Design a protein around this ligand. Sequence first.
Ligand SMILES: Nc1ncnc2c1ncn2[C@@H]1O[C@H](CSCC[C@H](N)C(=O)O)[C@@H](O)[C@H]1O
Length: 206
Amino acid sequence: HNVDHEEIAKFEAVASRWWDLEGEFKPLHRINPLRLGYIAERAGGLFGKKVLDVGCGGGILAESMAREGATVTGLDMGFEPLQVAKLHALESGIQVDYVQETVEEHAAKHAGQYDVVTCMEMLEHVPDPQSVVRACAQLVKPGGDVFFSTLNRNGKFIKPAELLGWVDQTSLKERHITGLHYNPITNTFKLGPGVDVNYMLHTQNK
Ligand SMILES: Nc1ncnc2c1ncn2[C@@H]1O[C@H](CSCC[C@H](N)C(=O)O)[C@@H](O)[C@H]1O
């Protein structure tokens, strides 16, 4: 129900390109060590934790979290991205459980089961983002961590201030927020203050 079929078709159409490091998803590949490092730091490590990756797509974050010893469920509504995720995980020799369903359906069946829920670059593609925020809150264990982010911009952006309003209506507490910026001194992208055009948000279930 809470799905934009057009948005899904778009990602389904480019699913084969997902793991091309120089293709359309290059920014996600480049960003991933950073968000993975952020998640591991904020959640206090990922080893042996149950982790749900909402709108996992081709599995860029999901696979990498499983590599750190997390028990990862990847969720998406796109058929082809999940086919690609499943195959790529097998090619890597990494175990990830990939499922095709909405986060609301998953929440109704798996409430409170996850130590960590990640929801990256997904919200802007959803007809009703508040519902996704509510589901993530429902999915997470007490004391669990929920992360939201939009680190990739191009040619629909949910402002962080608006997302905070959504988080405030749930059992999730905002813990930390940071932006992604180019650092000329180090010639690298780094997480830091300033969320005008992108962000990463750490919330914790209370
Ligand atoms: N309503 C919905 N339910 C589940 N997945 C959705 C969705 N709307 C969009 N998506 C998925 O969200 C993904 C956005 S691309 C982001 C991929 C991944 N989260 C990452 O950052 O690495 C696409 O795979 C798309 O199919």
